[PDB]
Amino acid sequence: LEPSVVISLSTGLSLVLGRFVFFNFQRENVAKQVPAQNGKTHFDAGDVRAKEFAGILKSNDPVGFNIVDVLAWGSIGHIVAYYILATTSNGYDP
Amino acid sequence: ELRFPRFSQGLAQDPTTRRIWFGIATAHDFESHDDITEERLYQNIFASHFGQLAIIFLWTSGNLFHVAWQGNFESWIQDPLHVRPIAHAIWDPHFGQPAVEAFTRGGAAGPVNIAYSGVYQWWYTIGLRTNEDLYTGALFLLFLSTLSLVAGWLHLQPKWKPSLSWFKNAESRLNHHLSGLFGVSSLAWTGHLVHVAIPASRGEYVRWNNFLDVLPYPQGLGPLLTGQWNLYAQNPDSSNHLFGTAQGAGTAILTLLGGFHPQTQSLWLTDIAHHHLAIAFIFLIAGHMYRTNFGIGHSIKDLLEAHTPPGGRLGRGHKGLYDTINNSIHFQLGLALASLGVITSLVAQHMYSLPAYAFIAQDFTTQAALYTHHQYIAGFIMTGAFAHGAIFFIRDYNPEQNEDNVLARMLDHKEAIISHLSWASLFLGFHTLGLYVHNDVMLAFGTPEKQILIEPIFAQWIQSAHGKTTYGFDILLSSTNGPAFNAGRSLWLPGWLNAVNENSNSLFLTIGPGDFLVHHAIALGLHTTTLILVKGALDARGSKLMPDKKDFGYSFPCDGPGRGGTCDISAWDAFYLAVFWMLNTIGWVTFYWHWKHITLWQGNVSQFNESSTYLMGWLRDYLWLNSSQLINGYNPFGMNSLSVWAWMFLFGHLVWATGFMFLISWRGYWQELIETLAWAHERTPLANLIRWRDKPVALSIVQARLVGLAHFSVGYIFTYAAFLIASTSGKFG
Amino acid sequence: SAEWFPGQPRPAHLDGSSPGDFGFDPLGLATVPANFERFKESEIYHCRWAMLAVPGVLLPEALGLGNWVKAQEWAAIPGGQATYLGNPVPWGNLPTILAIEFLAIAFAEQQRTMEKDPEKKKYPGGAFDPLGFSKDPVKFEELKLKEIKNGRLAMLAFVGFVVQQSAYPGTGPLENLGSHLADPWHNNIGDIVIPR
Amino acid sequence: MFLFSGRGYWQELIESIVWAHNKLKVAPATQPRALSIIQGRAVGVTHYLLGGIATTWAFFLARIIAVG
Amino acid sequence: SHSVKIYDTCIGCTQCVRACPTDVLEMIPWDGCKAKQIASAPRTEDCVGCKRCESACPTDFLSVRVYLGPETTRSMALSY
Amino acid sequence: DIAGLTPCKDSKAFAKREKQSVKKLTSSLKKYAPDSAPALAIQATIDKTKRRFENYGKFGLLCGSDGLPHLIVSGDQRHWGEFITPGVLFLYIAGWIGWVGRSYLIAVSGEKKPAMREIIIDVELASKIIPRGFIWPVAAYREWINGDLVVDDADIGY
Ligand code: CLA
Ligand code: CLA
Numbered sequence A: 001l002e003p004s005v006v007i008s009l010s011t012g013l014s015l016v017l018g019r020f021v022f023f024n025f026q027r028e029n030v031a032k033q034v035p036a037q038n039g040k041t042h043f044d045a046g047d048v049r050a051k052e053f054a055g056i057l058k059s060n061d062p063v064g065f066n067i068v069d070v071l072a073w074g075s076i077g078h079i080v081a082y083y084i085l086a087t088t089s090n091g092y093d094p
Numbered sequence B: 001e002l003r004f005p006r007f008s009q010g011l012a013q014d015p016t017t018r019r020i021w022f023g024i025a026t027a028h029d030f031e032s033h034d035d036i037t038e039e040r041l042y043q044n045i046f047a048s049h050f051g052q053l054a055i056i057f058l059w060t061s062g063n064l065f066h067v068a069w070q071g072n073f074e075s076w077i078q079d080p081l082h083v084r085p086i087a088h089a090i091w092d093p094h095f096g097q098p099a100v101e102a103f104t105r106g107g108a109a110g111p112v113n114i115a116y117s118g119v120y121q122w123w124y125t126i127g128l129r130t131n132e133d134l135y136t137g138a139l140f141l142l143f144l145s146t147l148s149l150v151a152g153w154l155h156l157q158p159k160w161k162p163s164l165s166w167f168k169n170a171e172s173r174l175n176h177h178l179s180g181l182f183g184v185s186s187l188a189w190t191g192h193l194v195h196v197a198i199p200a201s202r203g204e205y206v207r208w209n210n211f212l213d214v215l216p217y218p219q220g221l222g223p224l225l226t227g228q229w230n231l232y233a234q235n236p237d238s239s240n241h242l243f244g245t246a247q248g249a250g251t252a253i254l255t256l257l258g259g260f261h262p263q264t265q266s267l268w269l270t271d272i273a274h275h276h277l278a279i280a281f282i283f284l285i286a287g288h289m290y291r292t293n294f295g296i297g298h299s300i301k302d303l304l305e306a307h308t309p310p311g312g313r314l315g316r317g318h319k320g321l322y323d324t325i326n327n328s329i330h331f332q333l334g335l336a337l338a339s340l341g342v343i344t345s346l347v348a349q350h351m352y353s354l355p356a357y358a359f360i361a362q363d364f365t366t367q368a369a370l371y372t373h374h375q376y377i378a379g380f381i382m383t384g385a386f387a388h389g390a391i392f393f394i395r396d397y398n399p400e401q402n403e404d405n406v407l408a409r410m411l412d413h414k415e416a417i418i419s420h421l422s423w424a425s426l427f428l429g430f431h432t433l434g435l436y437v438h439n440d441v442m443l444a445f446g447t448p449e450k451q452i453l454i455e456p457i458f459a460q461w462i463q464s465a466h467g468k469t470t471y472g473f474d475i476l477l478s479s480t481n482g483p484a485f486n487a488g489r490s491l492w493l494p495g496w497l498n499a500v501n502e503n504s505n506s507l508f509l510t511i512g513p514g515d516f517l518v519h520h521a522i523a524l525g526l527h528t529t530t531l532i533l534v535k536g537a538l539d540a541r542g543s544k545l546m547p548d549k550k551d552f553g554y555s556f557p558c559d560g561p562g563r564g565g566t567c568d569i570s571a572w573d574a575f576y577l578a579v580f581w582m583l584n585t586i587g588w589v590t591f592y593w594h595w596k597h598i599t600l601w602q603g604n605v606s607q608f609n610e611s612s613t614y615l616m617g618w619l620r621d622y623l624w625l626n627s628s629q630l631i632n633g634y635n636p637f638g639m640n641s642l643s644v645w646a647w648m649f650l651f652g653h654l655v656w657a658t659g660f661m662f663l664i665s666w667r668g669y670w671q672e673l674i675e676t677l678a679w680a681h682e683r684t685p686l687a688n689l690i691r692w693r694d695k696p697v698a699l700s701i702v703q704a705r706l707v708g709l710a711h712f713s714v715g716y717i718f719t720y721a722a723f724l725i726a727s728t729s730g731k732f733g
Numbered sequence C: 001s002a003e004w005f006p007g008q009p010r011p012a013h014l015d016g017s018s019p020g021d022f023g024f025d026p027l028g029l030a031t032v033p034a035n036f037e038r039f040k041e042s043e044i045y046h047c048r049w050a051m052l053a054v055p056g057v058l059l060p061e062a063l064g065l066g067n068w069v070k071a072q073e074w075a076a077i078p079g080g081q082a083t084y085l086g087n088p089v090p091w092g093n094l095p096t097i098l099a100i101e102f103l104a105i106a107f108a109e110q111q112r113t114m115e116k117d118p119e120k121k122k123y124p125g126g127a128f129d130p131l132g133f134s135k136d137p138v139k140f141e142e143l144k145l146k147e148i149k150n151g152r153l154a155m156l157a158f159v160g161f162v163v164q165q166s167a168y169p170g171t172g173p174l175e176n177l178g179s180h181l182a183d184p185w186h187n188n189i190g191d192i193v194i195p196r
Numbered sequence D: 001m002f003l004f005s006g007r008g009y010w011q012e013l014i015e016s017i018v019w020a021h022n023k024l025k026v027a028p029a030t031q032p033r034a035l036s037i038i039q040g041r042a043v044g045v046t047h048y049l050l051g052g053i054a055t056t057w058a059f060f061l062a063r064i065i066a067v068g
Numbered sequence E: 001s002h003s004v005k006i007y008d009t010c011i012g013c014t015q016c017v018r019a020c021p022t023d024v025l026e027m028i029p030w031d032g033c034k035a036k037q038i039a040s041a042p043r044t045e046d047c048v049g050c051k052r053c054e055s056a057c058p059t060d061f062l063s064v065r066v067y068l069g070p071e072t073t074r075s076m077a078l079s080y
Numbered sequence F: 001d002i003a004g005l006t007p008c009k010d011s012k013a014f015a016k017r018e019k020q021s022v023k024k025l026t027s028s029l030k031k032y033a034p035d036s037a038p039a040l041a042i043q044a045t046i047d048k049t050k051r052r053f054e055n056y057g058k059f060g061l062l063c064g065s066d067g068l069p070h071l072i073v074s075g076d077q078r079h080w081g082e083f084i085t086p087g088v089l090f091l092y093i094a095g096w097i098g099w100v101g102r103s104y105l106i107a108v109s110g111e112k113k114p115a116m117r118e119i120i121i122d123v124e125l126a127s128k129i130i131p132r133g134f135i136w137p138v139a140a141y142r143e144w145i146n147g148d149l150v151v152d153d154a155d156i157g158y
């Protein structure tokens, strides 16, 4: 009913789920999925614009939580918040 | 690099006229050019795509400029049901005075052409109102067309050429094209609808000089940020609204009404806005699936390598398909062309039943033209898909790296596949032709009560499920007390049900036994065309009659008269045979559409319902009856405005027939004849002082097949277009 | 031979010393042992939930509180408020019910699959066997058999509940039993099987 | 159909159909073959002439009997 | 000019050499078959691409193969 | 009734069509002597027409707004005489023909030149195989069970 509370609560719950619940499964499935072409990654094959950025990925968090993860779970938080905030006044939607 | 063509030494040393023809025909086959590498192929393709964009922008800008300069858009805006829009002026010095008088129409001061493309309705629905707006649009498109050429020139210089590994980054391209090209474009168009077109449909004029001050909504973006989105729907337009005016206007921008606008007989604008907003959201979400540089995203190769049925019935599954697809451009072109053909047909089917442009539903000739045009384009695209798919098997397919996956097993059970397709075609042909002939005989002997008339019960049942009440079925949306009826009872069911049960529009037309028969004929066409193309593709690499076919390439004349004779054995020839069946099938589809609608618009449905069950009905009541005006465009007593169409009609019949000459008579007859003419010229005084420099020869075998099929297709199209336009516009305008 | 079908040969991959093996596998879905172990675990997990659910379907209907289907109706009413034993639930709001359930159950079920021991995967110890009954392996296996049997019998009963609910909308499980006891020779499955 | 095409396509199709007949023990000893090139041309011109001439025959006879 | 190739399934029957209308082929000694000879194609600049040689060959599949290539005055059989 | 259709025994358009056809026949009948052969032929045609309309009416067919009978093939048990029973008859006869053809081909393939027996039929042999199509559904089923109907994929070749 109050957006400034609903959005904060939804974002907090999504971040908690990301950092403490599904962290291991995501970080172990990611290691097995690296795009490649003819047995070599895109940057190894010659694409100079396919280099993986290194500055933004490092973090001092104990488990490796970073900014990209922050944005990935924060987006889910805002989307779910505005889903609940819309089917309250009058919304008959899935 | 010696002479034309510079890209082929084999053609450049040819001393005959064959050098010129073939030089034109292989210009855009970059893979076959001398000393070509993999990287230059991609770079040249990129430049050519920029060229296509420049040409498209020029075409659209020309349309806008000519309409603004010589049209009656402003006059048409005020009386859209009785004024005929103007395409462009006519300046022909061959004209006589009666033609000058006859072609002066639409309120113009000179002879003109009437437009049937529907651009007036389209441009009026999106908020354009004056000739100045059209001029600015044409100039802007002229700027974009120049931008395309400049970019194409720039990306072809050594400093600015992308590398080969750039063109093969599949995940990044998919992300950018899903998120940005589809979703963000939809967002921008929704913004245009909210800021410009919807206000224009209420008497408010927003342009580039005042759009900042005016608010699209009285309460602004407050409801969006706070989440009270339902405020954007609560005051929709009235049922007595006049489209260009403020009488009955509302204030909503996003609705879920359904049905049609009672005056314009088209979809509500707020529904289109909400639609594009939701679609934009879906694409924006879809575009985050794949991994580029940030440690998140799926991998396509790893997705393919995993989905393998553990029972072993699909061999090794999808293992190895990533490289097979990503290293072959023909595979990619085939997938893209197939998808585009399917959606071209879907566009054609959905634009006649659910019109989106104001006052276009009443313009019968325009609707007919659009449906026919897009169905023929779809047919050509569908044939091309299988053509480039067959090219894949010869040029790029590598057996060793596809061992025991689905693609190899397709080649493994080709006999079973082809035989079952043949059985389906035989069954449909035998029993459909038999029923038609039985009904014809019953009509001839004067006993119409002995016909075989099968009611299309399944389709009527589905129509009842969608809300139609004609057939007395009580199921789903046609029932009053059910979960499906209750769930949508307040959202969109009222307008939808009002639209479906109105029998003046073309939303779920009433159907009968004639519809049953013609639908099974259309199914026959689809199955047989697919048989021809699939047999071409799967036998491309070889068969029992020619086990080493892949060494000879995609297109070659034959393998000689030995082993029984081998005429028309290549895959190119299978494509050539399939194009005829494609034209046949699309002809059946468009004939059926046109006759059903022409009897709908005259208020005489029983004519179709009774004459369509036997073939003499089609010949007499559709073809013969609807030609009478067309063939009187000019006669011994004078001419009228249909004369051009009448002329075009005959033009078509000519080109068609000329094609027969190339298809029936073959090369050896013509070469012997040509030798005699060469002898005659070399022996004639006052004329042997002139010499040829390319030795004349008869056309090649494959070239003749191509030229004959081209004359056939051009004649086909021009004849039907003349008949359709003349027959409809003579009755309705 | 096969115990489920007397006079029938046993499957090649079956006939092992499993808790509940009767040689029944017509489709041969258990050829790979790595799939077979996870199928055993999945069977145990379905069995336990069905056994726990049967009383939860039979008790409220028998206490005159509404059948298992009508208890979900208040969630479809916009002003619907939950009730438990006739006492309204203050926090019966749908969003928090749908939120905390997901949030708690996700963690509770994510914890259980981090275990790597396959034998301990099906049957853990610690805080799940407070009284303790694994002291005797023979009686342990006997109890395992007597658990899997009742679990299969409970899954059958739940599927029967669903089908009988679909056959008679608006009714409950024990209502059908009462109707059957009222007219045994006239109220049976014959009417649905042979429809009028 | 006979005039516009060639026999290699049709023999290739017959191979697939013969596979299916072999599957069920009904492949004839008299091995099926497509028509020779000359026979294709002959069948084509024969059916073209028969159809055209008969069309005109029916047209003439109905017209002159009804109106004459 | 067309390309003509001979494969080692040849039985040295000599029918292809007799069938050629412009003298492209000839027989040479060999030790791989019972006839102790094999075909050869030393004069392919005079080939017209008629494929009579393929029509004459008895082995399955063929032992002489013709691939049509770039056209010349000789290969188009032009007398003018 | 079904799909908004009307039974032909209660359709006004059906009776109108019958009356129109009978009147058209009677107009021709009124051109000849009562005892001449053409008059008798026309009278026989009229009686046949009346019988046809009566039988269509009383066999339970349905008629549309045009006044012509329509067939129902969705499975409804009130119309099995329209498609299902004749379909069973068609399948039985077709199975008989195919079964006797296959059995002749199998019985004749064991000779020195089987093709000679395909352009010249051995009527003595065929007259012993023709009556056996009477029970083709049983024979084909038993042959399918024992694996004698189909050839394995590995064995298929010229
Ligand atoms: C967000 C970034 C972005 C964007 C906007 C584009 C845009 C484009 N790229 Mg891509 N590209 C990108 C990033 C991007 N790219 C990246 C990062 C890479 C490197 C990995 C590439 C690599 C790349 C290559 C190699 C090529 C392109 C090409 C193209 C063009 C495709 C042709 C076209 O115009 O289709 C237009 C398509 C649409 C508007 C969407 C389809 C809409 C369908 C048909 C439905 C329509 C529905 C609608 C209601 C109908 C209205 C009809 C109207 C009359 C009313 C297009 C301009 C091609 C090209 O032509 O380049 C010049 C090309 O060859 N791109
Ligand atoms: C996005 C679309 C697309 C693209 C990029 C390509 C690209 C390519 N195609 Mg593919 N193709 C497409 C669509 C496409 N195709 C479609 C829709 C079809 C089905 C009709 C085909 C069918 C096809 C075939 C059958 C073949 C190709 C081939 C080719 C290559 C070019 C050949 C060339 O230079 O022709 C040069 C162009 C011409 C000679 C012009 C031909 C014009 C025809 C005859 C009709 C012209 C009539 C004219 C308009 C009359 C006007 C009269 C007036 C009074 C109105 C190239 C790889 C060839 C290939 O790769 O071979 C290995 C090849 O053989 N394509």
Ligand code: CLA
Binding pocket: B422, B425, B426, B427, B428, B429, B430, B433, B528, B531, B532, B577, B580, B581, D001, D004, D005, D013
């Ligand atoms: C009107 C012209 C016409 C007709 C009727 C056909 C018919 C057929 N074509 Mg052909 N075709 C045509 C034009 C036509 N084609 C043209 C112009 C082309 C472009 C070159 C092609 C190219 C083409 C290809 C490439 C293929 C076909 C195929 C087929 C078959 C499709 C399946 C089918 O309907 O089986 C039902 C059969 C029929 C409707 C044929 C007529 C049967 C008659 C009516 C039976 C009764 C005969 C009567 C008792 C005999 C009395 C005469 C005498 C004894 C006194 C069928 C035999 C496909 C095929 O072979 O599929 C298996 C196929 O692959 N056609």
Ligand code: CLA
Binding pocket: C004, C014, C018, C019, C020, C021, C022, C023, C024, C025, C029, C030, C036, C039, C040, C041, C042, C043, C046, C152, C153, C155, C156, C159
């Ligand atoms: C979902 C629950 C479930 C699961 C995962 C299993 C799994 C297993 N069972 Mg168990 N079983 C179950 C339910 C289940 N069972 C029920 C309800 C009964 C009583 C009827 C039994 C009775 C039973 C016996 C008697 C035996 C097993 C055995 C097995 C093992 C080998 C068979 C196999 O591979 O199954 C894998 C199963 C699946 C992958 C599920 C496939 C489901 C399909 C796709 C749809 C089924 C729809 C259903 C038939 C609809 C009608 C239901 C209605 C009749 C009630 C395996 C560990 C054998 C064994 O050796 O155990 C150690 C053995 O002897 N089961």
Ligand SMILES: CC1=C(/C=C/C(C)=C/C=C/C(C)=C/C=C/C=C(C)/C=C/C=C(C)/C=C/C2=C(C)CCCC2(C)C)C(C)(C)CCC1
Binding pocket: A011, A070, A071, A072, A073, A074, A075, A078, A079, A082
């Ligand atoms: C614990 C901790 C900490 C803290 C942290 C934090 C506090 C964080 C936060 C975070 C956050 C807080 C995040 C967020 C994010 C977000 C996002 C990412 C969002 C997104 C969004 C979106 C995307 C949207 C969209 C949209 C629109 C635009 C419109 C309407 C619709 C929608 C809504 C859909 C620290 C550091 C001290 C360290 C220690 C520990």
Ligand SMILES: CC1=C(/C=C/C(C)=C/C=C/C(C)=C/C=C/C=C(C)/C=C/C=C(C)/C=C/C2=C(C)CCCC2(C)C)C(C)(C)CCC1
Binding pocket: B331, B334, B335, B338, B342, B385, B386, B388, B389, B390, B392, B537
């Ligand atoms: C040869 C070849 C090729 C080609 C291919 C092709 C050309 C294909 C095509 C294909 C096609 C052309 C297909 C199509 C399909 C379709 C489909 C599959 C559809 C579906 C649908 C659906 C499923 C729907 C549903 C529904 C409905 C109806 C209603 C509403 C709801 C829903 C949505 C559910 C390639 C390139 C690969 C390469 C290799 C070789």
Ligand SMILES: CCCCCCCCCCCCO[C@H]1O[C@H](CO)[C@@H](O[C@H]2O[C@H](CO)[C@@H](O)[C@H](O)[C@H]2O)[C@H](O)[C@H]1O
Binding pocket: C115, C120, C124, C125, C126, C127, C128
């Ligand atoms: C209706 C719902 C009612 C819920 C009631 C509350 C249930 C709470 C259960 C909490 C269980 C916590 O689990 C706690 O004991 C388990 C068993 O010793 C430990 O688990 C550990 O021991 C297991 C048994 O030897 C082995 O598989 C492993 O060594 C390890 O998983 C957990 O590391 C510990 O955290």
